[PDB]
Design an enzyme around this catalytic site. Structure first.
Site, PDB file in Angstrom:
ATOM      1  N   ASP A  35       6.913 142.391  68.356  1.00  0.00           N
ATOM      2  CA  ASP A  35       5.715 142.484  67.515  1.00  0.00           C
ATOM      3  C   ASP A  35       4.571 143.200  68.240  1.00  0.00           C
ATOM      4  O   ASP A  35       3.817 143.960  67.617  1.00  0.00           O
ATOM      5  CB  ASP A  35       5.223 141.083  67.099  1.00  0.00           C
ATOM      6  CG  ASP A  35       5.806 140.562  65.766  1.00  0.00           C
ATOM      7  OD1 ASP A  35       6.746 141.122  65.182  1.00  0.00           O
ATOM      8  OD2 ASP A  35       5.285 139.510  65.295  1.00  0.00           O
ATOM      9  N   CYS A  86       9.226 153.602  60.267  1.00  0.00           N
ATOM     10  CA  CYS A  86       8.739 152.312  60.737  1.00  0.00           C
ATOM     11  C   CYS A  86       7.665 151.867  59.751  1.00  0.00           C
ATOM     12  O   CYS A  86       7.887 151.997  58.545  1.00  0.00           O
ATOM     13  CB  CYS A  86       8.300 152.429  62.198  1.00  0.00           C
ATOM     14  SG  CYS A  86       7.196 153.871  62.615  1.00  0.00           S
ATOM     15  N   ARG A 141       7.015 154.153  66.594  1.00  0.00           N
ATOM     16  CA  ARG A 141       8.446 153.956  66.873  1.00  0.00           C
ATOM     17  C   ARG A 141       9.299 155.125  66.363  1.00  0.00           C
ATOM     18  O   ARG A 141      10.245 155.556  67.042  1.00  0.00           O
ATOM     19  CB  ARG A 141       8.943 152.642  66.250  1.00  0.00           C
ATOM     20  CG  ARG A 141       8.254 151.398  66.802  1.00  0.00           C
ATOM     21  CD  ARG A 141       8.633 150.127  66.038  1.00  0.00           C
ATOM     22  NE  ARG A 141       7.634 149.099  66.271  1.00  0.00           N
ATOM     23  CZ  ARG A 141       7.644 147.914  65.671  1.00  0.00           C
ATOM     24  NH1 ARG A 141       8.600 147.628  64.797  1.00  0.00           N
ATOM     25  NH2 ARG A 141       6.671 147.031  65.921  1.00  0.00           N
ATOM     26  N   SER A 142       8.997 155.627  65.156  1.00  0.00           N
ATOM     27  CA  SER A 142       9.746 156.756  64.581  1.00  0.00           C
ATOM     28  C   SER A 142       9.650 157.986  65.474  1.00  0.00           C
ATOM     29  O   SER A 142      10.639 158.717  65.649  1.00  0.00           O
ATOM     30  CB  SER A 142       9.220 157.089  63.183  1.00  0.00           C
ATOM     31  OG  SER A 142       9.527 156.090  62.202  1.00  0.00           O
ATOM     32  N   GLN A 199       2.003 156.607  69.395  1.00  0.00           N
ATOM     33  CA  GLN A 199       0.707 156.009  69.037  1.00  0.00           C
ATOM     34  C   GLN A 199      -0.055 155.408  70.216  1.00  0.00           C
ATOM     35  O   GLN A 199      -1.256 155.104  70.060  1.00  0.00           O
ATOM     36  CB  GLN A 199       0.913 154.889  68.005  1.00  0.00           C
ATOM     37  CG  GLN A 199       1.185 155.354  66.603  1.00  0.00           C
ATOM     38  CD  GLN A 199       1.424 154.171  65.653  1.00  0.00           C
ATOM     39  OE1 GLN A 199       2.434 153.464  65.747  1.00  0.00           O
ATOM     40  NE2 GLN A 199       0.486 153.946  64.764  1.00  0.00           N
TER      41      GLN A 199
END
Ligand SMILES: O[C@H]1CN[C@H]2Cc3c([nH]c4ccccc34)[C@@H]1C2
Length: 282
Positions: free
Chosen positions: A181, A215, A221-222, A262
């Site tokens: 998370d 994502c 994440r992508s 990110q």
């Protein structure tokens, strides 16, 4: 510089935030006018994540052709990817319309439906064989064929039917279920194992349309997934694998979608994944 020793040099000097801010400063800025039209407000999950006009995927519809999705075309590596946000309640039908029209074989999902106690994307595929889904706005039917649950990821076989023509196709759903998370994984080993499973299926190969990867926003994440895949492919293709420059590859990919990677922690994790992955390939 090479990668593994550039890596230890940034760790010892603690300058990941400065490296990452350089990338943010040099990244391309292209218009995203279609994304910002008022009629498309409920088609975007986040107001600051939009596809560029020049690389956006168009739906084959005359009313409204807009979806928050981008085509990342890597010329030297000879790989293409579609990066998109997690579907919204009012875009699940558009999502499967895109999969159909672009002739994709596989969908790669890097998030859970609920994270941090909030919804990160819609429940857009069926959970039981005998309870199929119909998307009336785009005239598609989706059925769960089989499901294989493993410790770090799940693979599903799905049948997508175009109800207008009665044509059917098999879609593979690759779901990475264990990204934490907060932060990034401690080791890249399970993420790399997952990437190799997607590769082995054929979903990334030129005989199919581009893989669809998402994502929640479709950039963090992508971005890590396609950056690692392309860097490893280039290390196999070139005479000198130490010439592959992960910062240059990332800036190339950011010509096609804003914001890929990110955080500085995601940048460090991407380096780690490519470094470890290059040892296993040989
Ligand atoms: O500490 C360094 C060791 N060698 C390389 C690989 C590697 C690192 N950290 C890791 C954590 C998990 C898995 C592999 C690694 C650094 C760079």
């Amino acid at each position: 510089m090479e990668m593994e020793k550039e890596f230890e040099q940034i760790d010892k000097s603690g300058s990941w935030a400065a490296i990452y801010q350089d990338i943010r400063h040099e990244a391309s800025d292209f218009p995203s006018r279609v994304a910002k039209l008022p009629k498309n407000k409920n088609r975007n999950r986040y107001r600051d994540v939009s596809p560029f006009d020049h690389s956006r995927i168009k739906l084959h519809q005359e009313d409204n052709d807009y979806i928050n999705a981008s085509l990342i075309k890597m010329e030297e590596a000879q790989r293409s990817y579609i990066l998109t946000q997690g579907p919204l309640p009012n875009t699940v039908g558009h999502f499967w319309e895109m999969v159909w029209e672009q002739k994709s074989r596989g969908v790669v999902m890097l998030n859970r439906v609920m994270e941090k106690g909030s919804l990160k994307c819609a429940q857009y595929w069926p959970q039981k064989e005998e309870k199929e889904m119909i998307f009336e706005d785009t005239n598609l039917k989706l059925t769960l064929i089989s499901e294989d649950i493993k410790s770090y990821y799940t693979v599903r076989q799905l049948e997508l039917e175009n109800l207008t023509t009665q044509e059917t196709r098999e879609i593979l759903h690759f779901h990475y279920t264990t990204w934490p998370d907060f932060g990034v994984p401690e080791s890249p080993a399970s993420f790399l194992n997952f990437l190799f499973k997607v590769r082995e299926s054929g979903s990334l190969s030129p005989e199919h349309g581009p893989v669809v990867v998402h994502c929640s926003a479709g950039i963090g994440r992508s971005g890590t997934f396609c950056l690692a895949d392309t860097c490893l492919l280039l290390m196999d293709k070139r005479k000198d694998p130490s010439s592959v420059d992960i910062k240059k590859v990332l800036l190339e990919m950011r010509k096609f979608r804003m914001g890929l990677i990110q955080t500085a922690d995601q940048l460090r994790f991407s380096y780690l994944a490519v470094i470890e992955g290059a040892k296993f390939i040989m």
